Structures are given as C-alpha cells and as structure tokens.
Amino acid sequence: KSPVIVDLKFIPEEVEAALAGAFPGREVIDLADPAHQERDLSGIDYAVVWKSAPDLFSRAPDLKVVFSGGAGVDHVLTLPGLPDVPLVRFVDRTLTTRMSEWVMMQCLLHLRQHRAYEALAKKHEWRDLSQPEAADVTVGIMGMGVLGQDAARKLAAMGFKVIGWSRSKRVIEGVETYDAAGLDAFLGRTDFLVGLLPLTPDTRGIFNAALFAKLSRNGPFGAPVFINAGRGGSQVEADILECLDSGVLGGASLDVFEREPLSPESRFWDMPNVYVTPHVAASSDVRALFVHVEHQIARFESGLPLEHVVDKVAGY
Amino acid sequence: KSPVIVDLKFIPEEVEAALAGAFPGREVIDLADPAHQERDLSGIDYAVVWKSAPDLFSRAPDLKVVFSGGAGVDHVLTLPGLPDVPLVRFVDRTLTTRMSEWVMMQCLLHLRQHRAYEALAKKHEWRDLSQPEAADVTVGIMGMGVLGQDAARKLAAMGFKVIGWSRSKRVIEGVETYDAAGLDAFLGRTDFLVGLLPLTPDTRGIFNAALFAKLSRNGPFGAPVFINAGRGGSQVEADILECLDSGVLGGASLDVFEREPLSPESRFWDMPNVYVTPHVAASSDVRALFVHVEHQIARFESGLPLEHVVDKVAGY
Numbered sequence: 001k002s003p004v005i006v007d008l009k010f011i012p013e014e015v016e017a018a019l020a021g022a023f024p025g026r027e028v029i030d031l032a033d034p035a036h037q038e039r040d041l042s043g044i045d046y047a048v049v050w051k052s053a054p055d056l057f058s059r060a061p062d063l064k065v066v067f068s069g070g071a072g073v074d075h076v077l078t079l080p081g082l083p084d085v086p087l088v089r090f091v092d093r094t095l096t097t098r099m100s101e102w103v104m105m106q107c108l109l110h111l112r113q114h115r116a117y118e119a120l121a122k123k124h125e126w127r128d129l130s131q132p133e134a135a136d137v138t139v140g141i142m143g144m145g146v147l148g149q150d151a152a153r154k155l156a157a158m159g160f161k162v163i164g165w166s167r168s169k170r171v172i173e174g175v176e177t178y179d180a181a182g183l184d185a186f187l188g189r190t191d192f193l194v195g196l197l198p199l200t201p202d203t204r205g206i207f208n209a210a211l212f213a214k215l216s217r218n219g220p221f222g223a224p225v226f227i228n229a230g231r232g233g234s235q236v237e238a239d240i241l242e243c244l245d246s247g248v249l250g251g252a253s254l255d256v257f258e259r260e261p262l263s264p265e266s267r268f269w270d271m272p273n274v275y276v277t278p279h280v281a282a283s284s285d286v287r288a289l290f291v292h293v294e295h296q297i298a299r300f301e302s303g304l305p306l307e308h309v310v311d312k313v314a315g316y
Numbered sequence: 317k318s319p320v321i322v323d324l325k326f327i328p329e330e331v332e333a334a335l336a337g338a339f340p341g342r343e344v345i346d347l348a349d350p351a352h353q354e355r356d357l358s359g360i361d362y363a364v365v366w367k368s369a370p371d372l373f374s375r376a377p378d379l380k381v382v383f384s385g386g387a388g389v390d391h392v393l394t395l396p397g398l399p400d401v402p403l404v405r406f407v408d409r410t411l412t413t414r415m416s417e418w419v420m421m422q423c424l425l426h427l428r429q430h431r432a433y434e435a436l437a438k439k440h441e442w443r444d445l446s447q448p449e450a451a452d453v454t455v456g457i458m459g460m461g462v463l464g465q466d467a468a469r470k471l472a473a474m475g476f477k478v479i480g481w482s483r484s485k486r487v488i489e490g491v492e493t494y495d496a497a498g499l500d501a502f503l504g505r506t507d508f509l510v511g512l513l514p515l516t517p518d519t520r521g522i523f524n525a526a527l528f529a530k531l532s533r534n535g536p537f538g539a540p541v542f543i544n545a546g547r548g549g550s551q552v553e554a555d556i557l558e559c560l561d562s563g564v565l566g567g568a569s570l571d572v573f574e575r576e577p578l579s580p581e582s583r584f585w586d587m588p589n590v591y592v593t594p595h596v597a598a599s600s601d602v603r604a605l606f607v608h609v610e611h612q613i614a615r616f617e618s619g620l621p622l623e624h625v626v627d628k629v630a631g632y
C-alpha cells in the first residue's frame with residue numbers, strides 16, 4: 001500500500017491529533033517531523049499539502065494524486081514541479097458550514113451596527129440607534145460555488161435579501177443570480193458585498209475603487225460594506241483604504257490580504273470600521289480532511305473517478 | 317370612531333414617520349406632542365403605550381383595550397389605574413426576526429472568539445486560534461415562546477446544537493426541550509445560555525451564581541457564556557460580575573439590565589468579554605406596531621377575539 005505524505009502547515013497539535021488512526025494500513029510520513037527531513041519520497045502515490053516546501057515534488061516524483069489541504073489552490077498551482085496528475089481540492093460540509101458562520105457573523109456585525117454600539121460603550125453612553133432589519137439590506141455575493149451558495153441560502157434564511165454573481169448563471173431558490181455581464185447591475189443593487197471567489201489570473205485585483213463606487217448607496221446606511229474571505233490578491237488594499245477614509249465604503253470585514261500574514265504596520269489593524277481576521281474564515285478540520293482524502297484514495301484505487309478535481313488552466 | 321391614543325417613548329422621528337396614514341378614519345392623539353398635554357382623554361377606547369406617563373389611565377378612564385408597544389409587559393402591568401380590560405402585547409414577524417438576528421450575532425461572536433481576535437488585532441498580531449464549529453457548542457435557551465422558538469430554529473439551521481427550557485414542555489423539530497423540573501439537566505448540557513424569558517415574580521433573579529455554576533464546563537471553551545435579551549430584573553448582576561472575574565463565566569452578552577439605562581458607572585461597559593447593547597435586541601418597528609394595532613382593533617370591533625392577550629396574573 002502506498003504511504004501518504006502529509007505536509008501541512010496547520011496548527012501542529014491539530015495535525016498530530018488527527019493522525020492517530022488516520023490512513024489505516026498505510027505508512028503516514030508527516031514532514032513536520034524533523035526525523036523525516038532527508039527521507040527519500042519516491043515510489044509514493046499520495047501527498048496532502050498546504051504551504052509545502054519548494055523542493056517537495058522533486059523529492060516525490062511518483063505522486064499519482066495531490067490533495068490540497070484547503071479549498072483554494074492558487075498557491076499549490078505555483079509549486080515547482082507540481083506533477084501532471086489530478087489535483088484534488090478540499091470540499092466538505094465542515095468547511096462549508098464554518099465559512100457560512102463567518103459570513104453570517106460579518107453581515108450581522110455590520111447590520112447591527114456593532115462598532116457604533118462599541119464606541120458608545122467605550123463612552124459609557126446608553127443610546128438606541130435607528131435600526132434596519134436584515135430584509136432592508138441586500139447582500140451580493142461574488143462567487144457562487146460551494147461556499148457562495150451555502151452562505152447565500154443561510155443569509156436568506158436569516159432574512160437578508162440575497163443576490164449572487166459568477167461567470168455563468170445558476171439556479172438557487174430565493175436567490176436571484178447574475179452572470180459575468182450582469183456585474184454592473186448586480187453591484188448597483190448590492191449594499192453588503194461578499195467576496196467568495198478564488199484567486200485566478202482573471203480575479204486578480206477585481207475588488208478596486210471603480211468597483212466599490214458602483215455599489216449601492218441607496219441602502220439603509222447610505223454607503224456599502226465590503227466583506228472578503230476569498231483571497232487577498234483579489235483586492236486592491238490601497239483602494240479599500242482610500243474608500244474607507246472617504247466614506248465610499250462604510251466598513252469592511254477582511255479575512256484575507258494581499259500579503260499574509262498581514263504586516264504589523266498595516267493600517268487595517270487599528271481602523272474602527274474594519275474587522276481583521278487572520279485567514280480563519282473556515283479552518284480545515286484536519287480530521288475531516290483526512291477522511292476526505294481517505295475517501296478519494298479509495299475511489300481512485302477502485303477505478304471510480306476523483307471528485308473535486310481542479311482545472312489547472314482555470315486555476316480552480 | 318374612537319380616537320387612538322399613542323403614548324410611546326420610542327425614537328420620535330420613527331413614531332412621527334409611522335403616524336402618517338396610520339389608523340385611517342380615526343383621530344390619533346400623540347402624547348409626545350405638547351399641544352395635547354391637557355386634553356381630556358375620556359370616551360376613548362384605545363391606547364398604544366410604552367413607558368407612558370403615570371397619570372395616563374386616570375386621564376383615559378374609558379379604554380376598552382390597551383396595546384403594549386413591546387412584547388414584554390412587566391412595566392405596563394405596574395402602571396397606576398391599568399384598566400380591567402384586555403391588554404394586548406406586541407407579537408409580529410418583524411420583532412421576531414430582529415430578535416433572532418441579535419441572538420445569532422451573540423452566539424457567533426462568542427463562538428468565533430471575536431474578542432480574542434480583536435485583542436490580537438490591537439497588538440497588530442496575526443495568530444490563528446483553534447476553532448470549534450457551531451455543532452461543537454450547545455446553546456440552551458430559557459424561554460421557549462415566540463422568540464425562543466424562532467431563535468432556536470435559526471441557530472439549529474446554522475449548525476448549533478440547540479436545547480430549550482420553559483415551564484411546560486414543547487415540541488420543536490431538531491430541538492430537544494425540557495420542562496420546569498428538567499432545569500438542572502438542561503443547564504448541565506448548556507455551553508451558551510440564552511435568556512428569552514419575561515420578567516415575572518417567578519423569573520426575578522433567576523440568573524444567579526448558583527445557576528451559572530450548573531452550566532456545562534465540558535464545552536470547547538471550558539466555561540460557559542451568558543446571553544440575556546429577556547429582562548434585566550431576571551439576572552443578578554453582582555453574580556454575573558463575580559462569575560466573569562473568576563472565570564466561571566467566560567463571557568456574556570447583555571441587552572437588558574436591572575436598571576436601565578445602564579449606569580455610566582457600571583463595570584459592564586469596559587469589560588473585555590462583555591457585549592453591552594442598550595435594550596435594542598429587537599426594536600419595535602413602529603409601522604408594524606400600528607398595523608398590528610389596526611388589525612386587532614378591526615377584530616375587536618367585528619366581535620372576533622383579540623390575539624396575544626396577556627394573562628395579568630401570570631405577568632405575560
């Protein structure tokens with residue numbers, strides 16, 4: 001039976017804990033362990049990777065399937081020697097449900113004027129603010145795949161008006177959607193913009209000043225909000241900053257940044273209407289990752305086709 | 317046609333805005349207007365009241381129905397001269413949906429360790445924290461009426477494990493519930509305690525140190541959280557403070573207080589794991605209030621029975 005290489009830059013206690021009883025019957029080679037730093041890795045069919053070392057695929061030339069530890073593959077596609085074999089991304093109910101938690105939290109924080117109420121609290125001042133209900137706000141989600149769909153349905157169920165956008169059009173009860181050419185109509189209706197796009201050459205810098213200026217100003221706060229949990233390379237941070245300073249954006253939630261970890265010198269840390277999280281919108285449940293990997297190995301070895309394979313030309 | 321007295325201590329622009337076109341065919345006497353401060357109010361059948369003046373029912377001895385501006389009636393029951401006629405409380409989809417927004421926000425803030433991530437941000441420090449999913453947390457809701465039920469269903473749909481408690485037992489898909497005697501078993505399973513009880517003589521001071529000590533310590537954070545949006549008189553704030561200081565409570569969200577507005581000298585304002593909101597968990601949509609009132613007047617006058625009538629002996 002082939003070994004499984006595990007090269008995951010995740011919280012190490014979580015990886016170690018999940019290894020126990022994982023991949024039964026297979027040797028598991030965890031490259032976090034210094035004992036394994038010189039081991040040759042030829043003749044091994046499977047690797048599970050997240051921020052893996054540059055020389056990995058030169059050490060493991062015989063891989064038959066590469067498994068990403070995350071849903072996003074923009075970094076893995078750039079790794080030297082990435083083999084010409086299927087690359088399977090992480091898709092799982094645990095990941096999806098976690099992202100929807102984060103998206104719901106952001107939409108509620110901005111809806112319920114959390115920062116305004118915290119500023120009042122800091123002054124020890126009791127003051128009720130006029131308050132729209134979720135149905136008074138349209139959330140527009142750019143990115144209508146696994147995560148965008150689950151987030152949209154959950155937002156709608158909480159009472160938000162929800163609309164969606166992606167390259168092609170899709171059918172989702174209670175959610176009107178737009179295809180690529182509908183972008184401007186979608187943006188003009190959107191009060192809270194949620195980014196759940198992969199980073200690809202075609203989504204690079206898509207979230208810029210010109211796009212923020214097209215968002216709706218007709219909503220209950222008079223200015224839109226930007227929430228991104230896709231990839232940082234999709235946004236132009238200089239524009240986000242300028243828009244926040246001018247009031248073109250009323251606030252933002254950012255889980256992802258052009259350069260991560262976010263520099264300690266960034267202005268985003270101290271800004272009163274920005275919520276910064278360190279790329280934790282949906283943590284990979286490592287146990288679930290390994291169950292997904294085990295499952296796909298079983299299909300592969302039985303001749304069934306792999307699921308969630310990446311289109312490497314498209315970048316997702 | 318009888319006039320309608322409106323004596324509502326709500327945001328005045330909201331009341332004024334909602335008056336337009338309200339109660340068509342009836343004189344509307346808004347007691348916020350100084351012009352009406354000496355008007356006699358006999359021969360008037362209806363009043364809509366929230367924090368109304370003490371002498372109101374002596375000025376209006378002929379009321380046939382009193383309408384509260386809120387869901388809660390503990391204050392109105394204490395008003396001098398409250399007539400011996402039906403008292404109808406506010407119940408409406410707008411109110412319910414708003415409360416569920418607030419409850420969902422609190423459960424997510426505590427689940428997603430928002431204060432920990434804000435403390436990291438204040439130090440300009442990028443650090444991922446181990447993170448449970450909502451299904452790892454049990455939310456126990458004390459109070460299973462209109463609001464408790466809607467909040468429970470919405471929490472469950474977001475992935476939380478949800479359990480409920482109230483005097484009598486109730487049947488709710490996906491939510492196990494407990495009756496009065498099941499209190500201790502319910503508390504022992506609960507990680508996040510949500511209060512959606514009326515204030516009555518029987519719920520006064522129910523949320524105390526003895527009760528907080530019975531909450532589960534087996535959850536992912538090792539200590540429970542207290543969230544109250546019912547009434548402040550149900551909690552003992554001295555105990556909440558002591559429990560937070562000792563770590564018996566890991567955090568709290570409080571929308572209601574023993575004395576409101578909350579004193580500017582309260583410690584709750586500055587406490588890092590408390591979220592204070594100024595009794596805004598669900599604002600009355602005044603427009604919807606008047607539609608509800610108009611509707612009930614129509615039923616009353618057609619001989620149909622009034623809905624949402626309070627049991628004045630029970631206090632709710």
Ligand SMILES: NC(=O)c1ccc[n+]([C@@H]2O[C@H](COP(=O)([O-])OP(=O)(O)OC[C@H]3O[C@@H](n4cnc5c(N)ncnc54)[C@H](OP(=O)(O)O)[C@@H]3O)[C@@H](O)[C@H]2O)c1
Binds near residue numbers: 073166168203281283
């Ligand atoms: N912050 C975090 O912790 C975190 C966690 C997990 C994932 N993520 C990010 O979230 C992303 C989405 O994940 P997912 O599972 O939902 O992906 P998915 O199922 O592949 O969905 C991707 C969506 O983006 C659309 N899209 C791609 N390129 C586009 C373009 N140029 N114009 C318009 N639409 C475009 C796709 O449209 P089509 O269907 O028409 O192709 C599809 O609707 C991942 O790529 C990852 O970067 C972040």
Ligand SMILES: NC(=O)c1ccc[n+]([C@@H]2O[C@H](COP(=O)([O-])OP(=O)(O)OC[C@H]3O[C@@H](n4cnc5c(N)ncnc54)[C@H](OP(=O)(O)O)[C@@H]3O)[C@@H](O)[C@H]2O)c1
Binds near residue numbers: 386461463483
């Ligand atoms: N913070 C805010 O902005 C805000 C806004 C709206 C409402 N509220 C508060 O929320 C409360 C609940 O509203 P609601 O519409 O959900 O009320 P509801 O429909 O009357 O529900 C009340 C629930 O509390 C239970 N209950 C009452 N006394 C009890 C006792 N001694 N022991 C156990 N259970 C008891 C009732 O049980 P039974 O069914 O068995 O009687 C019922 O399940 C209101 O009274 C108001 O004070 C606050």
Ligand SMILES: [Cl-]
Binds near residue numbers: 250251271272
């Ligand atoms: Cl800001």
Ligand SMILES: [Cl-]
Binds near residue numbers: 560566567587589590
């Ligand atoms: Cl605290």
